Every structure is written in structure tokens, then in C-alpha cells.
Design a protein around this ligand. Structure first.
Ligand code: MG
Ligand code: MG
Ligand code: MG
Ligand code: MG
Lengths: 106, 53, 143, 145, 70, 123
RNA sequence: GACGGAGCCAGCGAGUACAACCUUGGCCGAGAGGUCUGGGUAAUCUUGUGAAACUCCGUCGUGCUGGGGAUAGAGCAUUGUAAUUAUUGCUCUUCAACGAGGAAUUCCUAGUAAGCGCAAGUCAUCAGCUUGCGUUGAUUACGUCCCUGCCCUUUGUACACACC
């Protein structure tokens, strides 16, 4: 009918850690409910985006600096399923701030 | 509408022009921000950059 | 119990290899010897002149044996050092690539080094055997 | 393993091309005393000659010296690539040239004179007593020498 | 050049008669008693070392110390 | 008699050989920078100036110097095709005259103009 | 120590589709560089950034010497529409001042001082600068008001625009 098992990679990216974790948990729950071939929520090394600015606008004063850093959390999950099921899983369980991304197919 | 009104401005401090001010001075072009420094500092939390350490 | 290059004092092994090469005569010297810099950030050509390109070749071979896949740029990077830029701090400068390339070619001709998938160069079976023999010889000498 | 002796059969303290090329200094690193022959060039010349580099400049047979001299003035004759010379492609003739000893200085002077005549910026700078190569002198070099 | 390090034969001879039942036999040591140095002293030492007499204890680069056979 | 002082050249070619060569020969002959410049596709850097020079040459006081042409492209190459013709090179203030020898080979117009009045305190 | 080989180990990074980012691997070139091909929107490819200082064996052995590298002269490259008022990269040559720096005075107490690179920042191109990062890694206090600055207490004041 439709059920032919593919190779599905799902990417998750955010700045908020807790939200991301929640999303991951939700995904895992969904997987459990659908009980499919599963590879765990693989965590990629968090990416710290750095900026260095002189605190002054004008330049006069003791030369003081800023370290404005933005940390990126990137995590991926691997599933073997029909694509429709994956879509269904991912159409719900969306939280604002977390980017849900699907590779789909081998 | 003049015969010319432009000199080659593809690179250098002539090409890069800020999002907010339009300053050619102190421009942060890292990660493709193109925001001049002071302005960036003022609105850093809005971008998502924070001062942790 | 068995001998391989990985079990030998390195410098000695290299020397042995060089000697072997010299004995052979076979390699193909391109004729840049006694003219060239080795690294483009140097004050002098080799302090042996007659040879030591053999030595270089041997070293390269050893490196290849040690690793999986080796190229020209990588070799240059390995062999280059810090150029005295005058009244300015030192910087890493890659070695003379052409020389490296020539060496590689020579090796290939000999039947020591072999072009690999993905890119770069690996070792031939004959080459491996030769290396082993050299190692054995070195061991014997040590004994 | 053995020391090569010689009591004093090969006479030390020599002169080559006008000025002094002294003993106890190596075959290559005593040729540096000759203006125009630097280091690498000297080494190349030595190689061409076929001299032991474990040798003093104080020794050397006359034939070898002669050969070296020959190599010196005309290098395009020999197996020297000749694209590491003073006047390559040249100011006047269009030939590979490398002046030596008492000649290079003269040539330089001539060049300077020519520049002055032309009335280029470098010439003017030279006339003044200043830095040609854009090394801006708000400071640096304050003894006139 | 302030001499001491040249070539000669008398010097060599002297060196040769300065090895059995001896404590100090280095490059620096050699230099000290108005004799040869650099990469000549070592050679001289070897010339005696090849025919027994001097034994090597340390063989580092540009630093070597020697002791006679007991 | 065969030589007085020494006859003047680019990198071989004599005074008479130079004047009748156009630019390709010069390009072939020149130092590397000049060659590179020539390779890089020029448009109206020499196209009008050369024409002007030619025009000047056409009408002459005979065995002296043609009508003085004024240049703003103060960083232009002197090729042995504009030899002799007097040109005024810009500095910000006032154009400055250039007499062109068979020794101005591939040299710029800027090294001749000089944009500052030189220092006077104790040279 | 210098120079030659050879040995050969990092951590922060950064990186393009509307552009021209990072660029291995193959050939050409003493270099610089070309070139063809790629791989990478990246824990995936550059990159194990096989970075320097270092360690091993050799050549010079304390002489403005092979210490040191300034000015110079000429060529060959590269970026850009444009390099003279050398942009810079490389090649040969030139070899200047300086044998550890007076009156002064800065910084520092542990993975710190110092040595050494690398890295992003600006950047079309340019690092002797800068924020970071590792690598190698000490000496000496573990204290006191003598100096210097600050603070407080008690005092004096005709100052309170405050000892200018
Ligand atoms: Mg140094
Ligand atoms: Mg990596
Ligand atoms: Mg010198
Ligand atoms: Mg600049």
C-alpha cells in the first residue's frame, strides 16, 4: 500500500537547551508509540558563536572588551520507517525556538 | 540619468554598508551580520547573543 | 618473532634506507640537486649536497608506510618550518612542493609508492617488503 | 674516522680576485668575503667546481681555484640555471648578468646615475639622502648614517 | 681566528700522547690545553678510541665526554 | 669610430629600433609588473592619450618639442612610442612637464610628477 | 647558539549558490604561483589545521664571525580598474646599527611569569596590532606598611566654586 521502510535522518537545532531536550523527548515518545527501528538522539558538539567588541562607542577610556557569545545546540535522530509516518510524527511536537529539520530518504 | 554616476564599489569599505546606520566604520561582518559595532552592542540580545563570560 | 618498520629507531632506519638507495642507483634524480632550497623558507641548500635527496625520499617512504594516504601539499606542510621574515615574527611555510612531487614520482617508478582511491598515495607490496628487509638489516646492525 | 694531517705542505693565507680569501675559513664561507659572491651562490659555484665542503679555503690546488674563477664571471656557460643573478634580463643588453668583486659596486653607481639623469622619484630620494622604498620616516634613522 | 684550532702534526702527536690513564678527554678539554677543537677534537679522540684506549660514555650532539679503558 | 659613450636601449633594442615598434613588442620585452598590466584588459587608459600624442607629433616647431598635452592618468606606463613628446603630469596642483628619453622604458608617469614639496631643514 | 637534515605533537576557530568562501588530491614551476579536478552550507571536506618553540645526528666553533639583519640593486609572481610614493609573496646579491642598554620605569605569585606558534578580528590585497587558543614551563614571597596610591579614625581650619 505505502509501507516501504526508508532511511530517515532528522535534524534539531536551537539556542534554548531545555526546549530542544523536550522536543527530543517528544520525538522519542512518538517513536515508542509507533515502535520502529531507532537510533538514539545523537548530540553534536555545541557551537559557541563569538564576538569581541570594545565596550566604548567613541574609543576614549581604558580599553575594555565584550564577549557576546551565542551557543548553538544541534542534535540528530535516525529512524527507519515509511515517510508518511515520519511526517505525521513531525507535523506535531513543534515548539517555538527549536528548528525541526528532515533529510528523508537514503 | 547622467552619462555616469558611479565608480567601482564592489569591495573595500565602500561596498560594505551597515544594516542600521549605514556606517563604513567598525563593521561586524562576521557570520554575515553586517551591523556596525555600537549598534550591535545596543541590540545584541535581540539577535540572541549574550554576555556569559 | 617478526620485524617491521614500526619497531625500529627512526633516524637509523632512514639512514639505512638512504644507503640502500645509493647502492641501488635506481630512483631517478631530476637534477635539481645542488641547486634547490628544499623548503622555500630556508637560508641554505642541504649541508651534504651529494645525496640527502635520497634521504628525503627514504623519509617520505617511511611516512607513507606509517600512514594510509599521503599527498604533496601534506608532505610540504610536514617538511616546511619557520622562515625568518626579518624584523618580523616567524611563520610556518610549506616546503618545496615540486621536489616532493618528483620524489613521489621516483618512488612510483621504483615500485614502492602507489596511487590510491580517494586521493594521494599509499604503499606497494614490494615496497613494504623492501622496508621490512631494511628494518631487519637495521636490527641486525644494532645487535 | 681518521684525521687528514698535512704539516704545512699546502700553503695557507691566500689572495683571490684582488682582495683577501683567508685560511681556516671553509671553501664556501671565505668566498663570501668577495663582494657579489654571497652564500648560496658561492655554494653553487663550489658544487660546480667539485670541491670537498669539508675543506679550508687556505688549502686548494691552483687548478681548482682557476676553475672556480672561470665559473664565477661566466655562469651561463655552466649548468647553473642563471635565473638567480643580479642583472637577469638586464638594464641594457638583455642578458643574464652577475657582476663580482670591484665591479658590482661600480655597476650600482652607474645605475644610480642613470636613475638620477632620468629624474625618477628614487633618484631624487637618493640625491636627498632619504628612504626610497616608502618606509615613512616620522621617526627611524636619526643619525644620517 | 685566534689559533689553537688549525690542523698540524705536532699537535696531533701531543694529543696522541695524552690518552692512557686519563680523566678528561672532551672537546672543551682539548681546547683548554692549547689544542684542537670543533669537529676535529672528536676525530682526534676517535683516532685513539679506534685502537682501544679511550671509551665513550656520552655521545650527545655537540656535547661528548670520554673515559679511558680500565 | 663606432660608439660615443654607449647607445641607449630597452633590454637590447636601440634608439632607432624603439620608435617604430608598437606596444606588443614592449609588452614582450618589459619587467613583470608592466607585462601584467598590459595583460589586464585596458580601456581608455592609453586610447585617447596616445591619439593626442600622435596629433601633437603631427604639428611641430621642427627639431624641438611638440604641443604640451595634459595628463591626469598620472599613473600610466611610458612605452617607447611616446618618446620626446612633452606631457604635463598632474599632482593635485599644476601639471608637470616630461621630456621622454630612450631610457624611460616601462616606467610610470607618477615618479616624474612628484605630489609634495620636499623637506628643507638639514639634509 | 646558528645552520642543515631528520624526528614530529596542539587547542580555540572560520568556511560559498547567486555566487565566487574554505579549498585537499593529480600535473606544471627553485620559488611565489599556476593549473585541471574535486570534497564541504560542515564532529562528515579544508584538518589529525602532522603549528612553531622543541628532540636526534651532523657542519662553525666564542672573530661585528657561518651572530644579526637594516638599507639597497635587479628580476619573477599575486590581488585589484590602478602598486612609482618598493601593496604584498618569492629569487640572487648587499651586508648597516647593535658584545645585553644610563637617568628612569612597566608587568607579574602557578599551569601563572616568560618562551613559542596558531586563531579569528579588520581583509579584494596587506600583521611587527587584537581578542582568544593551545604548546613548553620556571625563579621568589605566601609578607609588610619603607616607598606609591587609596580608605578610615582623631585632630586643626578664617577653606565649603572646598589648597589650582
Ligand atoms: Mg632567530
Ligand atoms: Mg579537524
Ligand atoms: Mg655578512
Ligand atoms: Mg595597508
Amino acid at each position: 500500500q505505502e509501507v516501504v521502510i526508508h532511511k530517515i535522518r532528522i535534524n534539531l537545532t536551537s539556542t534554548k537547551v531545555k526546549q530542544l531536550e523536550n522536543v527530543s523527548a517528544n520525538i522519542i515518545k512518538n517513536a515508542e508509540t509507533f515502535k520502529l527501528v531507532k537510533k538514539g538522539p545523537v548530540r553534536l558538539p555545541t557551537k559557541v558563536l563569538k564576538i569581541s567588541t570594545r565596550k566604548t562607542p567613541n574609543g576614549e577610556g581604558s580599553k575594555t572588551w565584550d564577549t557576546y557569545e551565542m551557543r548553538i545546540h544541534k542534535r540528530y535522530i535516525d529512524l527507519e520507517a515509511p515517510a508518511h509516518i515520519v511526517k505525521r510524527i513531525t507535523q506535531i511536537t513543534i515548539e517555538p525556538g527549536v528548528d525541526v529539520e528532515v533529510i528523508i530518504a537514503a | 540619468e547622467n552619462v555616469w554616476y558611479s565608480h567601482p564599489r564592489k569591495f573595500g569599505k565602500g561596498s560594505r554598508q551597515c544594516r542600521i546606520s549605514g556606517s563604513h566604520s567598525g563593521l561586524i561582518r562576521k557570520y554575515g551580520l553586517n551591523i556596525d559595532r555600537q549598534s550591535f552592542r545596543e541590540k545584541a540580545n535581540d539577535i540572541g547573543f549574550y554576555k556569559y563570560r | 618473532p617478526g620485524v617491521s618498520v614500526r619497531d625500529v629507531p627512526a633516524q637509523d632506519f632512514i639512514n639505512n634506507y638512504a644507503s640502500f638507495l645509493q647502492r641501488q642507483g635506481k630512483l631517478e634524480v631530476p637534477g635539481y640537486v645542488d641547486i634547490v632550497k628544499t623548503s622555500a623558507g630556508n637560508e641554505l641548500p642541504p649541508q651534504d649536497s651529494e645525496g640527502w635527496f635520497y634521504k628525503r625520499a627514504a623519509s617520505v617512504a617511511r611516512h607513507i608506510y606509517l600512514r594510509k594516504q599521503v599527498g604533496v601539499g601534506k608532505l610540504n606542510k610536514l617538511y616546511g618550518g619557520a622562515k625568518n621574515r626579518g624584523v618580523r615574527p616567524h611563520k610556518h611555510v610549506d616546503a618545496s612542493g615540486s621536489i616532493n612531487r618528483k620524489v613521489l614520482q621516483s618512488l612510483e617508478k621504483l615500485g614502492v609508492v602507489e596511487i590510491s582511491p580517494k586521493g594521494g598515495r599509499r604503499i606497494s607490496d614490494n615496497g613494504l617488503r623492501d622496508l621490512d628487509r631494511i628494518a631487519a638489516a637495521t636490527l641486525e646492525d644494532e645487535e | 674516522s681518521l684525521v687528514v694531517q698535512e704539516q704545512g705542505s699546502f700553503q695557507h693565507i691566500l689572495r683571490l680576485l684582488n682582495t683577501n680569501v683567508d685560511g681556516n675559513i671553509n671553501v664556501v664561507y671565505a668566498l663570501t668575503t668577495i663582494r657579489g659572491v654571497g652564500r648560496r651562490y658561492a655554494n653553487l659555484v663550489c658544487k660546480k667546481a667539485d670541491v670537498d665542503l669539508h675543506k679550508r679555503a687556505g688549502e686548494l690546488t691552483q687548478e681548482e681555484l682557476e676553475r672556480i674563477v672561470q665559473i664565477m664571471q661566466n655562469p651561463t656557460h655552466y649548468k647553473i640555471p642563471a635565473w638567480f643573478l643580479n642583472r637577469q634580463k638586464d638594464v641594457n643588453d638583455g642578458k643574464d648578468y652577475h657582476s663580482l668583486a670591484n665591479n658590482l659596486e661600480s655597476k650600482l653607481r652607474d645605475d644610480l646615475e642613470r636613475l638620477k639623469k632620468i629624474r625618477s622619484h628614487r633618484g631624487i630620494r637618493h640625491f636627498w639622502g632619504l628612504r626610497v622604498r616608502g618606509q615613512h620616516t616620522k621617526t627611524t634613522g636619526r643619525r644620517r648614517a | 681566528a685566534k689559533h689553537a684550532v688549525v690542523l698540524d702534526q705536532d699537535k696531533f702527536d701531543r694529543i696522541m700522547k695524552e690518552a692512557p690513564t686519563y680523566r678528561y678527554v672532551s672537546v672543551s678539554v682539548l681546547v683548554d690545553r692549547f689544542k684542537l677543537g670543533g669537529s676535529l677534537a672528536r676525530v682526534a679522540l676517535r683516532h685513539l678510541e679506534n685502537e682501544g684506549i679511550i671509551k665513550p660514555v656520552s655521545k650527545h650532539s655537540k656535547q661528548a665526554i670520554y673515559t679511558r679503558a680500565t | 669610430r663606432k660608439r660615443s659613450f654607449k647607445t641607449y636601449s630597452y633590454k637590447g633594442v636601440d634608439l632607432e629600433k624603439l620608435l617604430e615598434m608598437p606596444t606588443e613588442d614592449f609588452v614582450k620585452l618589459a619587467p613583470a609588473r608592466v607585462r601584467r598590466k598590459f595583460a589586464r584588459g585596458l580601456s581608455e587608459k592609453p586610447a585617447g592619450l596616445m591619439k593626442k600624442l600622435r596629433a601633437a607629433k603631427l604639428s611641430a616647431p621642427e627639431n624641438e618639442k611638440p604641443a604640451v598635452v595634459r595628463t591626469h592618468l598620472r599613473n600610466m606606463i611610458i612605452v617607447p612610442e611616446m618618446i620626446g613628446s612633452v606631457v604635463g603630469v598632474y599632482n593635485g596642483k599644476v601639471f608637470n612637464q616630461v621630456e621622454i628619453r630612450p631610457e624611460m622604458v616601462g616606467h610610470y608617469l607618477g615618479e616624474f610628477s612628484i605630489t609634495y614639496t620636499p623637506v628643507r631643514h638639514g639634509r
